[PDB]
């Protein structure tokens, strides 16, 4: 079901096995560098059930630059790329205690044998204006769409602005449960007959 879908929930306790497999997973987790997850909770997240072949996009900062690599590898991925977003203002000028930070990082992991992807279409630098606090740039969805067009995708720890066609968004600040894919709707009713998690 192409139009946006989402599930308000605590990603720790939701049974993600009901959602099927995704060509792309993206996550912007609350690392314990305000709703944080501990390193063990992050390690235990059931990312491995979500894909057999495809890509993982994992936003990282501070010590999660290292801890995100750990989770990525533990979850069964190999880091094959790292996107950086150069944060600019409206005049295309650039906006960790040793250096000032002009950028945010997003690791790119591959799992299995993905085929039918358009590798090489985008480059690994994003230049885009800062919207809000902790808001990631919308350009990442265009890059992800060109890499794997039309496929089903899932975002963990998304916010309401992050919902997108072809994406299912999980996050604890979304407004309720909105699901349209019939295979998912079935497995959700079966696993959650009273609609609570």
């Amino acid at each position: 079901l192409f139009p946006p879908q989402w599930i308000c929930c605590d990603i720790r306790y939701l049974d993600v096995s009901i959602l099927g497999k995704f060509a792309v997973v993206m996550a912007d987790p609350p690392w314990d560098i305000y709703g944080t997850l501990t390193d063990d909770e992050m390690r235990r997240l059931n990312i491995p059930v979500l894909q057999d072949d495809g890509f993982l996009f994992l936003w990282v900062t501070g010590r999660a630059m290292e801890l995100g690599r750990e989770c990525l590898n533990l979850w069964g991925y190999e880091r094959v790329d790292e996107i950086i977003w150069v944060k600019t203002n409206q005049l295309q000028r650039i906006i960790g205690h040793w250096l000032n930070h002009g950028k945010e990082h997003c690791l790119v992991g591959v799992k299995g044998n993905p085929q039918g992807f358009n590798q090489g279409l985008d480059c690994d630098v994003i230049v885009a204006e800062v919207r809000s606090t902790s808001h990631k740039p919308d350009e990442i969805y265009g890059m992800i769409e060109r890499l794997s067009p039309g496929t089903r995708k899932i975002e963990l720890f998304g916010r309401p602005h992050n919902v997108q066609p072809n994406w299912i968004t999980l996050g604890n600040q979304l407004d309720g449960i909105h699901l349209l894919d019939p295979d998912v709707v079935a497995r959700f009713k079966q696993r959650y007959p009273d609609g609570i998690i």
Partner: protein, 242 residues
């Protein structure tokens, strides 16, 4: 304006459109005044006992020639990881490690931990292509690689983390001289080592060691003399002591 779409359309990398890419010039003068004379040594570092380099360094810049630098003797991460960097670093010291853009972003972190550092900054050399708007991808690459990372590590107790310059010519392996400004502005100390530097990177305030150097002037005791008292603990950002 979607600059990722614009790059897909035109071949112009998004960094091409960053614009602009009071008086921190006294600091520079003080750096220039306290700088030791340049010193340098031709050495084949695989065959070379690293302990011969004394004293222990406050700052180590490490720039191994990765195979990926030669797109059109290279060092693998295997070779690099077996370097005994911990034996020549001062107990409180810093490292800056050029990691390229591939597996080095992972293996370079292994090296930093192996030698006793933790990463405190990730510095990105972002390469524009204003003067030539295609790249031959590493097989594992999902995206076109238009940057390189220099990891900063610390062991023991003004600038941004971006360098933007135009992508050098095919087979030019030089890194932007701006990395030296960033390092020197940190005021980390005056014992500064550049491993795998070249004739073209020799620089005041630095000891350069590499296989392609054509001349040497390194002497252990002469080099130590620059840091004997009353100069042992200078940041390299203060006046020389009278």
């Amino acid at each position: 304006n979607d600059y990722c779409q614009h790059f897909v359309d035109t071949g112009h990398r998004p960094q091409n459109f960053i614009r602009d890419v009071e008086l921190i010039r006294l600091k520079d003068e003080l750096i220039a005044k306290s700088n030791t004379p340049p010193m340098y040594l031709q050495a084949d570092i695989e065959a070379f006992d690293i302990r011969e380099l004394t004293p222990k360094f406050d700052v180590i810049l490490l720039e191994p020639p990765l195979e990926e630098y030669y797109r059109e003797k290279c060092w693998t991460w295997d070779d690099i990881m077996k370097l005994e960097i911990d034996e020549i670093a001062a107990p409180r010291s810093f490292i800056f490690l050029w990691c390229g853009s591939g597996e080095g972003l992972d293996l370079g972190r292994v090296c930093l931990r192996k030698w006793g550092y933790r990463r405190c900054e990730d510095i990105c050399w972002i390469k524009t292509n204003k003067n030539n708007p295609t790249k031959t991808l590493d097989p594992k690459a999902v995206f076109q690689r238009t940057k390189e990372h220099c990891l900063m590590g610390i062991k023991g107790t003004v600038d941004i983390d971006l360098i933007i310059t135009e992508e050098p010519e095919i087979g030019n392996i030089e890194k932007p001289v701006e990395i030296f400004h960033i390092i020197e502005h940190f005021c980390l100390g005056r014992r500064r080592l550049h491993l795998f530097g070249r004739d073209s990177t020799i620089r005041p305030g630095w000891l350069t060691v590499g296989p392609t150097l054509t001349n040497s002037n390194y002497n252990a005791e002469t080099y130590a003399s620059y840091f004997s008292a009353p100069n042992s603990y200078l940041t390299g950002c203060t006046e020389e002591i009278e």
